[PDB]
From Swiss-Prot, chain B:
This is Large ribosomal subunit protein uL22c. It is found in: Plastid, Chloroplast. It comes from Spinacia oleracea (Spinach). GO terms for cellular component: chloroplast; large ribosomal subunit. The chain holds residues 30 to 151 of 199 of the full protein. Belongs to the universal ribosomal protein uL22 family. Component of the chloroplast large ribosomal subunit (LSU). Mature 70S chloroplast ribosomes of higher plants consist of a small (30S) and a large (50S) subunit. The 30S small subunit contains 1 molecule of ribosomal RNA (16S rRNA) and 24 different proteins. The 50S large subunit contains 3 rRNA molecules (23S, 5S and 4.5S rRNA) and 33 different proteins. uL22c binds 5S rRNA in vitro; the central segment of the protein (approximately amino acids 30 to 124) but not the last 28 amino acids are required for this binding.
Swiss-Prot record, chain D:
It comes from Spinacia oleracea (Spinach). SUPFAM superfamilies: Zn-binding ribosomal proteins (SSF57829). This is Large ribosomal subunit protein bL32c. The keyword Ribonucleoprotein applies. GO terms for biological process: translation. Keywords: Chloroplast, Plastid, Ribonucleoprotein, Ribosomal protein.
Amino acid sequence: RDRKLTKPEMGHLEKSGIIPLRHLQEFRLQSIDGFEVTQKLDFGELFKEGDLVDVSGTTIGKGFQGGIKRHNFKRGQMTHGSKSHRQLGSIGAGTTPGRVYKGKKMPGRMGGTKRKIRKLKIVKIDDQLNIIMIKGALPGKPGNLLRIAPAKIV
Amino acid sequence: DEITTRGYSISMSVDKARRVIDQIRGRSYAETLMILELMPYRACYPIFKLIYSAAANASHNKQFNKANLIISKAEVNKGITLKKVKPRARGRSYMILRPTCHITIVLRDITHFDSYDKFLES
Amino acid sequence: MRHGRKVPKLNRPPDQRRALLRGLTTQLLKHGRIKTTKARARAVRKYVDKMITMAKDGSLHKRRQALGFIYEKQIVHALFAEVPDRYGERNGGYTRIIRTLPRRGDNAPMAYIELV
Amino acid sequence: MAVPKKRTSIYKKRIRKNIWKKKGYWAALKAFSLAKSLSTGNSKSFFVRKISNQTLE
RNA sequence: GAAGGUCACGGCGAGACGAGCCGUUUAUCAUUACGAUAGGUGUCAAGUGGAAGUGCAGUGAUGUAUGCAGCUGAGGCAUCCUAACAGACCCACAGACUUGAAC
RNA sequence: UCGGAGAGAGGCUCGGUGAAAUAGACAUGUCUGUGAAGAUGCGGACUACCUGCACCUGGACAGAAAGACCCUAUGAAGCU
RNA sequence: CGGUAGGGGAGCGUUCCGUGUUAGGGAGAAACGCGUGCGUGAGCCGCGUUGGACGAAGCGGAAGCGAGAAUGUCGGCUUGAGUAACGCAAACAUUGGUGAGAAUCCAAUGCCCCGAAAACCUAAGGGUUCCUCCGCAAGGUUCGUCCACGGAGGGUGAGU
RNA sequence: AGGGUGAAAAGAACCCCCAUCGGGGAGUGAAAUAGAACAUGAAACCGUAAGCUCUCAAGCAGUGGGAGGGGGACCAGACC
């Protein structure tokens, strides 16, 4: 809480300690507040174990990802085909008013974006030292933030 | 327009160039010679000897000190072009033109009037 | 960017990389300072220090494979008895880079590589 | 590929000339490096034993 | 002429160019503020693979012992020895009128 | 059939040199309807900060071509 | 007293000529502004600046008599543009020399390609482009102290 | 394709910057805001400086009404 950051630290002295990377807020669920100790653990002491927990990570990035990658379903040759296969398959009309039908599958770009996996049971859970084991999946590559919210199955 | 020195028939252009003088405008004789020597642009020459051309002479020819000098006017104009021909396809879609430049700047003293006044009782 | 990329492939085939590199290498341990792009500097950097650590171990095992890189039988013996022995106390940092004034008529990059 | 109909020329073209703003010395401060009296704008050789010099004392 | 931003530098499981993320040799101030982002190096793992040299058996080829040895790209830990320079600039000085609730 | 990855020449950025088809004029959004009757510029209404880069590329009956199709003009050029 | 094609009825201006070596001008045409006054209109009059020579009031006469479009003609100049391209994919770099500057010149150490070939010789053609000393704006779709570029000299001596 | 600086060129010594290309001064001339691209040198096109308008507003966008702003007025008189 020294290097880089500066203003977020001083703006945290308000009864609390050790600042993370990014402060995240929650909703109503009947819990403790800043009046007893002001410090949440990783036990939740209420969400109950055994149940499934959702994981919202950060998607990766393939740069200016094309359209054949955001759908993966376009035939095309290469050794003799003029479509070179990789081509988006040539979309669009030839003599029709309309309005290029916006929103249709196209190349575009890719980058960091929320994902969320939902469900997924758990095999092991530990507190204090902080550590959790999710049933595979786990959006994004190890190095994001994740919200690891309870479960909004409702 | 006190002293105006430069030249013409330069081998540069009118587009790529000029963008260098538009940064030295309203700048002192120093703030302009400390930036050109860092500009990775070819336009830096003969525009480099330019800022030095407008100066120095105005020091022994007229009554203008080395300081208080600032680029008043500056602009790049297109001179004479040559209609060249380059083959490509049956020779038809061609004209070719070499946008030459002959900028003409000028230096002059600076106005400003400062006169701080305070009271010191003892 | 390639997830976990290292060592630029330049704008020429692989076999074209292990050929030009052989130059900036010997020329570095034969003269001292060599001018080149910032990319090449970062590239040759490792290809040079990795050739110095070999001489530190001596023996012949680090001489047969080494010869596979450089061909000059004059600069080879050097490492096995010249400057590497000087770094016998220093773990790494065999090479040193530094940026300078842009090229002449060309944009960039530009830097001079020399042994510390 | 295709061909433009009416060429406005004026206006439009001019606006697309802002992105090419005067890039004054594209680099950091790298001001006076002490005992340099001037020195180039962009970073340059530091001060210490005669280094980078073709000849020595 | 601060907070902050920006630029540059060293890089990025983030990028066409910009943006965005981490860091800038006290690895920015106190209290340990948890502050090696990269290259190299050392160790380890993994992938090939049991090579060079030498000795021995055989006319030779070839093989055997040391050798499950050596080599070793982006993987992991560790290590900042090299480059991340001391600084600048940009951005300012509690900051409009009327009315209501307070004083 | 679901193709993916990698190595090159372009593409992208910067430095130097440096074209074209085309074009009455521009502050040239969508939609319904209307209109010598499938216009963004009419009318109503909805939507919409100003201005670039890269890419995909339907509209402007886009560009090049007073079409080789038909017909018209007691035209022309060959042939049978 | 709307007006197309058309018919009819009135005028301005431009070049030149007669009436003019009369008169206006170097105390000065032409080119641009302004007074936005004037006529139904195309325009006219006066004048400032710039500029450099003659031009020409009035009526009439004689005109090759004033067009923004005939995919017009000639010349110059915008836009797409500063997008593409910079022309087989036989990569390139470095230490020095010279120069204001050179990755591509020269010199040295190598890589790489070809190897009946992008070697040499010769005919046709081309025709002085060969060599040396200098210079470079233009010609070399980068620069260039480089060049088959330019400007000066030198050089093809067989009865077979 | 491509015309004429001026009467006579006195068509620019020297000095300063640059690579001893180019320019600016010093001078000559009634003039070079006439000098070898040179006379008078408009328009299309391409820029600088100054006043006003200009991000929540759209359609060959001018016109009629019309606030404010930068200047010029008259010893108000409400105008350019």
